[PDB]
Design a protein around this ligand. Structure first.
Ligand SMILES: O=c1ccn([C@@H]2O[C@H](COP(=O)(O)OP(=O)(O)O)[C@@H](O)[C@H]2O)c(=O)[nH]1
Ligand SMILES: O=c1ccn([C@@H]2O[C@H](COP(=O)(O)OP(=O)(O)O)[C@@H](O)[C@H]2O)c(=O)[nH]1
Lengths: 425, 429
């Protein structure tokens, strides 16, 4: 028979892409998928992606949940309303037919929905969007806050305080309290699902392997990597460009770069001496006309997977969002790591240890006052684009990543084995 | 009369080498240097090095102050580093008479930072100008100068030149415990350094523009800038083997005078160096049995003291793996050899940031310290070492470092001018 799995995502492309990709893989291994999407949607633009994906096949169905909305922080308001309906969701889950084999929920909503799932005796699995290092920080942070130090079992004997997400720096914070809850809450979950593989984070996972879920099984389940217009002016341009000669710089869904900092990144690319593709009223009037021959910059949404797999692009300047890292790993693009906020610094550490790319540690976060000079920016880009051994190291990540993805690999085995937990007798 | 300067260096080749190089530079610009060397010598080997230096010329001189006998009941904690410091520190009071009696009278006294707390009061009594020579980098200097304020604060380190939020891991491992004699000794020296008439460093504006700019601001010297940068001070089986090797092909790996690398770690550097597949001259018991035979064509590993300056100037070497001792960092900067920064202890982690910011070398932050003991695996050593040699942009960056460092060192350069000005201070009307 065919198991039935409900997916409860959270707002934001960074959380949304993995869920779609995780849903796609579960359908490929026979499961039938029902997305729980609460209404009204935070973002019309993100809603289009879910609609088109669900529209494509009868294996996926959409369930609309009324938000039932009633510090006044802007992002938190959406989550509060998203999390308020937590109690109400319980009856709706039981009503769904055919009976769900299991529920898979976003980390952010882990604290809110885990009791509901436990109330109705529904197995609850958490999808972790981030790296295993970030997960390792999350799981052990409640213990750390009591007696802190900052030794994260997965990747740090003493993590520098800058590497912690910028909100987490002050303990008497609203963010800190929720963070401690999620970490504590995740241990109680039936399973945790991450988009990492053993080759990419052997150290963090091996430490993580010891952690044990309540239900007689390892808490953490790695199924990664998962594989699944504005580009119209881009793809033709890229094809003209020589093989592996174009720097690609993108910060993902949220790119809060200040104008002072912006001018420098722009100056660095011009001073880089290599072609660049940049995605975001020019600050320099003739900058665009002057640089048209060397590189193209587009303000719209683009097609990162096509760009990363494009032959002409040779390097990736990144903010080290976990989804973009995995996509860069698959591409084998050497990555220069400019982590912007949150878990992005820890992700940068993963990039360097893996050999996927190099991280200028002394470079600043969004909170930091100090700007990054263009001359410094130009050096690392030119260096990254000209280092053959860096390219070769990136190609090993790709091979290893594909190996885990390909059939028989450690990751596909874990997804096959996870599915069986649903096909119970 | 020709200016007469008194040098009171602390023990250790890393501290001794700048003094000697500064002494030669000062002598070159018309100075007679008198070395205050205590008896009994800490090290015969260092003492022989100094004696050979004094023999070089009539301008250099040797004067010995016998260390006062220790009081056994008084000694605290039984530590060899501190006991040696304590005997030299204890003779501070005795030192003033000897200084005044010198013939001809000394224009100024220039002393090691470590002994500066003990000796600075002596100088004020005899009205002798005291300058401290700072063996380390400007960034490190910034930490010493502001560490006392930071300690009585804190939420964020924020060393003025080094960073906004310096990581605790980057701080010297002794400093991590605040209630320590070392942490207190560190705090005293920093306070003392403001009082001093001047602070000399082995740096130049080109190398550390931001950190030096901030220091220009402190100007704690009465009526003058406190910081005087005169850097870069400039003054067997291995070479023959080097000459054979092809141009810019050899990885030089050396951790200075003190290189405590654990046995488990030692194996990894060998495997990593072997695996990288590029040539390597490794300076430092058969930890590897067939390792030397397998890599005999590729590299030379020797245990003796070696002419590092010749190595770094050699055309066949292409990359340098170091512990980022300021003396080693500055030597490489003159050579323009790209560096792979593996800081081991003390101020070396701060030095690594200067190597990465300069473009002289790349620093792998995640690499462990002697304090923490998670080893660096050979897979990472091989990749990082090989990539450094493979990377042409890294060579260009180091080449640019050399040019500016040469510029400062040559006539009309920032430092050369600054050294000239300092000699004038010693010779007034
Ligand atoms: O112009 C774009 C911008 C982003 N992406 C996608 O943004 C995804 C994940 O974003 P990430 O986690 O790396 O950054 P975050 O969303 O977390 O700020 C990646 O899968 C990209 O495919 C894209 O396809 N075209
Ligand atoms: O085999 C060696 C090791 C070191 N040095 C010299 O020791 C100097 C300073 O060493 P550094 O301060 O950088 O490290 P430390 O000795 O203080 O740990 C360098 O200038 C080298 O010339 C040398 O000549 N031969």
């Amino acid at each position: 028979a065919v198991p039935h799995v409900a997916l409860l995502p959270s707002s934001g492309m960074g959380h949304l892409t993995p869920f779609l990709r995780l849903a796609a893989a579960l359908a490929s291994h026979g499961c039938v998928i029902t997305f729980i999407t609460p209404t009204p949607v935070v973002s019309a633009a993100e809603a289009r992606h879910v609609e088109a994906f669900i529209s494509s096949s009868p294996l996926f169905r959409r369930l609309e949940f009324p938000l039932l909305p009633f510090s006044d922080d802007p992002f938190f308001l959406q989550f509060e309303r998203i999390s308020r309906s937590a109690r109400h969701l319980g009856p709706v889950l039981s009503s769904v037919s055919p009976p769900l084999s299991a529920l898979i929920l976003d980390v952010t909503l882990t604290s809110s929905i885990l009791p509901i799932a436990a109330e109705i005796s529904l197995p609850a699995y958490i999808l972790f969007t981030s790296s295993a290092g970030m997960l390792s920080l999350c799981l052990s942070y409640p213990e750390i806050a009591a007696s802190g130090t900052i030794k994260i079992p997965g990747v740090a004997e003493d993590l520098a305080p800058s590497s912690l997400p910028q909100p987490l720096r002050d303990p008497r914070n609203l963010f800190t309290g929720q963070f401690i809850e999620n970490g504590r809450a995740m241990a109680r979950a039936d399973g945790i699902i991450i988009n990492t593989w053993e080759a990419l984070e052997p150290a963090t996972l091996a430490a993580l392997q010891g952690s044990k879920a309540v239900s007689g099984f390892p808490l953490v389940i790695p199924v990664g990597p998962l594989l699944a217009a504005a580009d119209d002016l881009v793809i033709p341009w890229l094809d003209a460009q020589p093989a592996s000669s174009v720097v690609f710089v993108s910060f993902g869904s949220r790119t809060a770069l200040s104008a002072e900092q912006l001018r420098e990144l722009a100056a660095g690319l011009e001073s880089s001496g290599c072609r660049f593709l940049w995605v975001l009223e020019l600050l320099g009037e003739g900058f665009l006309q002057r640089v048209e021959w060397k590189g193209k910059v587009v303000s719209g949404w683009v097609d990162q997977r096509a760009v990363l797999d494009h032959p002409s692009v040779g390097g990736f300047v990144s903010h080290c969002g976990w989804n973009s890292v995995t996509e860069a790993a698959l591409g084998g693009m050497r990555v220069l790591a400019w982590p912007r906020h949150g878990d992005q610094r820890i992700n940068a550490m993963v990039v360097e240890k893996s050999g996927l790319g190099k991280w200028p540690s002394l470079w600043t976060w969004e909170g930091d006052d100090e700007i990054v000079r263009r001359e410094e920016i130009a050096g690392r880009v030119a260096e990254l684009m000209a280092s053959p051994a860096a390219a070769a190291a990136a190609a090993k990540v790709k091979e290893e990543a594909v190996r885990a993805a390909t059939a028989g690999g450690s990751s596909q085995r874990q997804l096959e084995d996870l599915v069986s937990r649903f096909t119970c007798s």
